[PDB]
Amino acid sequence: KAQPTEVSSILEERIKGVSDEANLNETGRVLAVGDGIARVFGLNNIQAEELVEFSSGVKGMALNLEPGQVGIVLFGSDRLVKEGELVKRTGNIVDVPVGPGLLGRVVDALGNPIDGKGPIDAAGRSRAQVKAPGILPRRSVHEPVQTGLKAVDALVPIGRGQRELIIGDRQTGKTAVALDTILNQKRWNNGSDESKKLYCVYVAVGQKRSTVAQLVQTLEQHDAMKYSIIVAATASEAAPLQYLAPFTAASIGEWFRDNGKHALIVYDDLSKQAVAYRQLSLLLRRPPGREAYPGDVFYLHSRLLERAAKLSEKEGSGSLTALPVIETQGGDVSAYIPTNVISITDGQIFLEAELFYKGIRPAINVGLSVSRVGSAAQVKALKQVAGSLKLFLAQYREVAAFAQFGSDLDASTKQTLVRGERLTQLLKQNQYSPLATEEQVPLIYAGVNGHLDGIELSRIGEFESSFLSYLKSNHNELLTEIREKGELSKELLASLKSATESFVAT
Amino acid sequence: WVRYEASLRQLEQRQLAKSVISRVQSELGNPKFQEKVLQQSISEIEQLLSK
Amino acid sequence: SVLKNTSVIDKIESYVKQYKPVKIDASKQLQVIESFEKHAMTNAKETESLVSKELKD
Numbered sequence A: 001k002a003q004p005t006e007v008s009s010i011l012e013e014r015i016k017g018v019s020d021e022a023n024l025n026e027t028g029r030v031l032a033v034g035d036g037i038a039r040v041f042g043l044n045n046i047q048a049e050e051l052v053e054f055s056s057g058v059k060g061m062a063l064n065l066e067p068g069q070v071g072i073v074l075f076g077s078d079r080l081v082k083e084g085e086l087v088k089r090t091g092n093i094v095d096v097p098v099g100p101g102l103l104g105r106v107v108d109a110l111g112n113p114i115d116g117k118g119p120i121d122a123a124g125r126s127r128a129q130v131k132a133p134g135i136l137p138r139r140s141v142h143e144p145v146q147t148g149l150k151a152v153d154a155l156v157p158i159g160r161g162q163r164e165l166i167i168g169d170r171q172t173g174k175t176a177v178a179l180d181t182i183l184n185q186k187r188w189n190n191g192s193d194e195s196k197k198l199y200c201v202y203v204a205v206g207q208k209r210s211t212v213a214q215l216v217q218t219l220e221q222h223d224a225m226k227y228s229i230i231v232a233a234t235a236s237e238a239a240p241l242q243y244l245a246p247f248t249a250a251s252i253g254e255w256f257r258d259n260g261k262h263a264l265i266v267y268d269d270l271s272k273q274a275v276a277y278r279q280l281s282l283l284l285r286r287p288p289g290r291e292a293y294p295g296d297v298f299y300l301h302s303r304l305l306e307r308a309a310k311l312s313e314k315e316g317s318g319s320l321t322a323l324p325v326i327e328t329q330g331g332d333v334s335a336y337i338p339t340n341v342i343s344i345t346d347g348q349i350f351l352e353a354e355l356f357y358k359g360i361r362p363a364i365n366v367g368l369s370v371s372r373v374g375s376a377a378q379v380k381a382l383k384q385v386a387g388s389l390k391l392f393l394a395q396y397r398e399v400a401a402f403a404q405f406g407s408d409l410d411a412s413t414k415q416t417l418v419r420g421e422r423l424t425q426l427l428k429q430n431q432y433s434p435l436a437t438e439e440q441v442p443l444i445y446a447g448v449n450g451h452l453d454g455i456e457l458s459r460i461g462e463f464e465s466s467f468l469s470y471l472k473s474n475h476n477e478l479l480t481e482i483r484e485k486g487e488l489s490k491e492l493l494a495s496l497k498s499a500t501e502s503f504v505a506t
Numbered sequence B: 001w002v003r004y005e006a007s008l009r010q011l012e013q014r015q016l017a018k019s020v021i022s023r024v025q026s027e028l029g030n031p032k033f034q035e036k037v038l039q040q041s042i043s044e045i046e047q048l049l050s051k
Numbered sequence C: 001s002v003l004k005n006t007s008v009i010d011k012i013e014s015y016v017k018q019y020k021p022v023k024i025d026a027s028k029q030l031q032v033i034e035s036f037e038k039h040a041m042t043n044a045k046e047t048e049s050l051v052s053k054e055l056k057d
């Protein structure tokens, strides 16, 4: 094992060189270290939110620079640090390693490898706090992000550079729909067209290590870990790490965005980041705002999310897609953090336990789930083609407005109720089963013609699988036509109608 | 076999870390508190020569 | 090449190379399927004779 030997020799030689040329005099001395934060006197030249190295080895970061003393949030436990310990300022604002070598690796908030797969190969270092792109460098979101689930694609499409919030209650499928979005990209990431490749960045802030292991193994099984990036901020890890990990993952995604590549970063949880930052403020002597949350949780969320954008062709035509989460308390959408994040994201995806137990497996609440770019950021074959696919959302809202509670007026009302019930029956999708747009479009079309005569609602689950199999056999020409061309021609619509009639006849 | 070899590398790193305690104890009983002081003093002198 | 102290990759590769002809195709059916076809041909020809004579009638 010559590798540990030469890496130890190189690191120790660098330490010797640093010792030979350090001349650190204004370095600080710790006065009072609290619960994961320390107040240090000195560092008269410290930059704000600049990384520091304590004598015990725990890294720090400077939020509040009071006159004389500065508050250092510790990126780890306060076991090792004691009063009077030397602190070494790194001289640079906190940053995270970025590049293409981060793919296939799991890293902490600071970007250090935690998967035990060796050192991280980074093309460069990007600041954890990076200003979002301006008005001009961005571009209107037009390229869709293929989530692979029928309900979300049809009703709340996500596009490259869009910020769609997966807002929901506890264990209502938030990380689940995040995972289906994550996995569906394997269809294009296994190809060669980088313009369609969509590299993935998961932010596991506040999740437990067992959940992160579940995540990484699940991505490993479905050939997805190679193009995905796991930034894990464990709850046991220090609260500053939880606060910073989404920002560092945002920088990692911005690396792809600025290099002409498209990145999907799922800010899963981010309410745990919110409460971790609340902890940071409430021990940093900062007075809180509402429900003891600090003043800049709105500014924090907005500044973090705005880094996700669709860059213009002049900037490389790259994109960075955000998929934040909000864990509501008892379905309380009308709460400070939820409505705050909804006002940031370009639409939200609502999931409640009500639809989860009612049968809707994606738990897509079509009412409060709205996307800010309906026609754009959607597959042309799925957007309007036959018209009904466009006012699909309005039809769902009507079905909700005249559901079984409303009086069954007449045969038209009965037909509308049947159409709505069959449509919500269709939208249910099994977990870890990303269903492609070339297969989504025939099913959505079948939800407008041939939907009403379905033999029992429960049988539509197997009817969908049989219809996929039917489209696979001597109809793969239609599937590849709608996959490649994107738009649907009149002859294509006629062929799809004929196939639907032939299948519903059987 | 691949992840067995990966675990073998992890185990050899862990055994090196285990031997690190004996390495530390080697200099703990070594009367090192005189040569190290002189070396760090001359290193400080060299450091301040530039400054 | 990623594996350094394999001592077994050569063995499994040699086993796979020796077992490349895993098995030949099973083209056993050459008369019973022909029997089914001759029965089907007889049924079809008698059927169409009956149909043609019935429409002409």
Ligand SMILES: Nc1ncnc2c1ncn2[C@@H]1O[C@H](COP(=O)(O)OP(=O)(O)O)[C@@H](O)[C@H]1O
Binding pocket: A169, A170, A171, A172, A173, A174, A175, A176, A177, A361, A362, A363, A429, A430, A431, A432
């Ligand atoms: N297709 C599906 N969509 C959503 N949830 C599903 C699906 N199939 C099963 N589930 C169950 O729903 C739960 C989703 O909760 P999850 O997304 O883990 O929320 P959280 O991460 O906030 O606990 C999972 O525990 C899973 O067992």
Ligand SMILES: [Mg+2]
Binding pocket: A173, A174, A175, A176, A268, A269
């Ligand atoms: Mg989750």
